Design a protein around this ligand. Structure first.
Ligand SMILES: C/C(=C\C=C/[C@@H](C)C(=O)O)[C@H]1CN[C@H](C(=O)O)[C@H]1CC(=O)O
Ligand SMILES: C/C(=C\C=C/[C@@H](C)C(=O)O)[C@H]1CN[C@H](C(=O)O)[C@H]1CC(=O)O
Lengths: 97, 145, 194, 49
C-alpha cells in the first residue's frame, strides 16, 4: 500500500541470522545474503546489532521490546492430613500410643 | 574535579552531602479495621462448625471423657497451629528491618533506588571504588532505562 | 493423692509434647516463609545452581560480549564457560529445556509473551534488560525508508500493527483433614455411646 | 542448610575451604570470571597461608 512493488518471499539458503567468524572476518548468514548477489537492499533486521546497523540503509525499528527471562513456575500443595506427617518420625506417634 | 578542570569555582559558601529520602515508616498501622491481620476466616468457620457439632453431641447425649479428649486434642492442635503461624509472621517481620544506611539499601533489592540522570551523584557512584557504592551503582546501571 | 500427681504428670507431658510440636511447626513455617523465588536478573547473575543460556550466533550474545553492566558481564562469563555444555541454537530447544530441566531461557518479551499465552506453566522474570528494536531493512531511495517513521508509524498510531499483535498471540487443607478426623472421632463416640 | 553445592560454599564462610596450592587447582578459578568462583578465589587468597 506504500509503494505497489512486487515481491517473492523466499527462504534463505543459510538458515541463519548470521554473525561473523572472528577466525575469518567474513560476515555470514543474512549479512552475507545482502552481498552474495541477491539484494543490496537490506531485508532482515537481525534484531539490533551495532555492525548489523552498519548495513546499507538500515531503517528505524517499528517495534520496541526488551530482553527478559522465561522460566517455568513451581507449584505444590499439601492435601489430606499432615499433622500426623511431620518431619519428625512416626515412632513418636507410636510412643504416644 | 570533572568540572573543576574545565571552569573555575570559588570557595564553597556552604557544604553538604548526599543522603536518602524515603517514605516514613509511620503509617500503614494494623488494626481491627483492616481485615486479615489475624488468619483466614475459613478456619474460624470450621471451628464454629466444630462447636456446633459439640453442642449437637451434648444434646443427643466414659463416652463424654473421650469426647472431651478429642475436643481437647483438636483445639490444642488448632491453637498450636495458629501460634506457629503467628510466630512465623512475627519472625519474618522482625527479620526485615527499615533501611538505616547505604549497605542496608544495597542488600535489599525490593526497594528501588536511583538518582538524577547524569548528575554529580551518579557521576560519583560511577567513579566509586568502595564495594557497597559499586554494588549500588551496578544496581542503578541495571535499571538505568 | 497419687492419682493427682499422675494426672499432673500426664498434663505437663502432653504440654511438653505439644510444645515440641509447636516449635517444629513454627520452624517449618518460618523456613517456608523465608524462601524467595527468582525475581531479578541479579539472581541469575549470582546463583549458579540453575543453569541458564540463550541462542547462539550473536544477537543477545553480542550484547553479552560488549556488556559493561558488570553483572551481565558475569552472566556472559558463565555462559561462555557453559557454551559447549548448556546452550541451545533455536528458541524451541531452550523452551523445552525449561520444561524438562531446571533451566532459564533469556529471550525477547514477544516470544515469552507468546509462550505464556500458549502455556500457563511458564512465567516471565525481569523487565527490559537490554532495549532492543525490531524493524525491516530498506532499499536506498525506497518510499518506506522514510515512511517507516511516517506511514508505518501512522499505522502504529492507528494500532493496525497493534491489531496484528493482538490478533496473533492475543492474550484449609490440613485443617480440613483435622476436621475430618474430628468428625470421624464424633462417629466413634456415637458408636461407643450405643 | 546442608551445603550440596559450591555456590553455598561461596555463600557460607563458616566452613573453611581451600585446595592444593599448585596445579589445576588455584588456577582454574583464579582466571575464571564467574562470580561464585571469583568469590571463592578471593576467600582462598585471603587464607593463602
Ligand atoms: C534463532 C536465532 C538465532 C540463533 C541461531 C541461528 C538460527 C542464527 O540465526 O544464526 C534468531 C531468531 N531471530 C533472532 C534475531 O533475529 O536476532 C534470533 C534469536 C532471538 O532473539 O529470538
Ligand atoms: C595434588 C596435585 C599436586 C600436589 C602437589 C605438588 C606435587 C604440585 O602441585 O606440584 C596434583 C593432582 N593433579 C593435579 C594436576 O594434574 O594439575 C595437581 C594439582 C590439583 O590437585 O589440581
Amino acid at each position: 500500500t506504500i509503494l505497489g512493488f512486487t515481491y517473492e518471499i523466499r527462504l534463505v539458503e543459510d538458515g541463519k541470522y548470521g554473525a561473523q567468524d572472528d577466525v575469518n572476518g567474513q560476515w555470514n548468514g543474512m549479512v552475507r545474503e545482502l552481498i552474495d548477489h541477491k539484494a543490496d537492499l537490506a531485508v532482515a533486521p537481525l534484531a539490533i546489532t551495532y555492525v548489523r546497523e552498519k548495513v546499507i540503509d538500515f531503517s528505524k525499528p517499528f517495534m520496541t521490546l526488551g530482553i527478559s527471562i522465561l522460566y517455568r513456575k513451581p507449584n505444590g500443595t499439601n492435601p489430606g492430613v499432615f499433622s500426623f506427617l511431620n518431619p519428625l518420625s512416626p515412632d513418636i506417634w507410636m510412643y504416644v500410643l | 574535579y570533572v568540572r573543576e578542570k574545565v571552569i573555575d569555582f570559588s570557595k564553597p559558601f556552604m557544604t553538604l552531602g548526599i543522603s536518602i529520602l524515603y517514605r516514613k515508616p509511620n503509617g500503614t498501622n494494623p488494626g481491627v479495621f483492616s481485615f486479615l491481620n489475624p488468619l483466614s476466616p475459613d478456619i474460624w468457620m470450621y471451628v464454629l462448625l466444630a462447636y456446633l457439632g459439640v453442642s449437637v453431641v451434648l444434646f443427643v447425649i466414659l463416652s463424654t471423657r473421650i469426647v472431651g479428649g478429642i475436643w481437647w486434642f483438636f483445639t490444642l492442635i488448632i491453637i498450636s497451629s495458629y501460634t506457629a503461624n503467628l510466630a512465623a509472621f512475627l519472625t519474618v517481620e522482625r527479620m526485615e528491618s527499615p533501611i538505616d544506611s547505604a549497605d542496608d539499601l544495597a542488600k535489599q533489592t525490593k526497594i528501588e533506588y536511583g538518582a538524577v540522570e547524569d548528575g554529580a551523584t551518579m557521576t560519583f557512584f560511577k567513579k566509586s571504588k568502595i564495594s557497597t557504592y559499586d554494588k549500588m551503582w551496578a544496581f542503578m546501571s541495571s535499571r538505568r532505562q | 493423692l497419687s492419682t493427682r500427681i499422675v494426672g499432673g504428670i500426664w498434663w505437663f507431658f502432653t504440654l511438653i509434647i505439644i510444645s515440641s510440636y509447636t516449635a517444629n511447626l513454627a520452624a517449618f513455617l518460618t523456613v517456608e516463609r523465608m524462601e524467595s523465588p527468582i525475581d531479578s536478573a541479579d539472581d541469575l547473575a549470582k546463583q549458579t545452581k540453575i543453569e541458564y543460556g540463550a541462542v547462539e550466533d550473536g544477537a543477545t550474545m553480542t550484547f553479552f560480549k560488549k556488556s559493561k553492566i558488570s553483572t551481565y558481564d558475569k552472566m556472559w562469563a558463565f555462559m561462555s564457560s557453559r557454551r559447549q555444555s548448556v546452550l541451545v541454537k533455536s528458541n524451541e530447544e531452550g523452551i523445552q529445556r525449561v520444561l524438562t530441566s531446571d533451566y532459564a531461557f533469556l529471550m525477547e518479551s514477544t516470544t515469552i509473551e507468546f509462550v505464556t499465552q500458549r502455556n500457563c506453566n511458564l512465567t516471565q522474570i525481569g523487565g527490559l534488560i537490554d532495549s532492543k528494536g525490531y524493524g525491516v531493512g530498506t532499499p536506498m531511495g525506497s518510499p518506506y525508508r522514510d515512511k517507516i517513521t511516517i506511514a508505518i508509524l501512522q499505522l502504529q498510531e492507528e494500532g493496525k500493527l497493534h491489531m496484528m499483535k493482538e490478533k496473533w498471540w492475543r492474550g484449609v487443607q490440613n485443617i480440613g483433614g483435622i476436621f475430618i478426623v474430628l468428625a470421624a472421632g464424633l462417629v466413634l463416640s456415637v458408636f461407643v455411646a450405643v
